[PDB]
Amino acid sequence: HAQGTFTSDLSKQKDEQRAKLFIEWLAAGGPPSAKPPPK
Numbered sequence: 054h055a056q057g058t059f060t061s062d063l064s065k066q067k068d069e070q071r072a073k074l075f076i077e078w079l080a081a082g083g084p085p086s087a088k089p090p091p092k
């Protein structure tokens with residue numbers, strides 16, 4: 054289905070950044086590093 058390709062691609066692109074962050078952000082040192090959470 055189209056799934057509103059534009060908004061779904063935003064949602065995918067957020068998921069990707071939020072996720073690569075999540076695991077890297079974790080590796081950096083989650084909230085202690087003073088780097089934002091995925092959101």
Ligand SMILES: *C(=O)CC[C@H](NC(=O)CC[C@H](NC(=O)CCCCCCCCCCCCCCC)C(=O)O)C(=O)O
Binds near residue numbers: 060063064067068
């Ligand atoms: C970004 O700018 C695009 C829009 C943005 N997308 C996201 O935030 C990421 C996708 C989003 N993820 C979540 O919402 C995660 C939490 C899901 C909780 C679901 C609870 C039930 C919801 C019921 C909705 C009923 C709707 C009725 C009318 C059609 C996602 O998966 O949507 C964004 O703002 O979503």
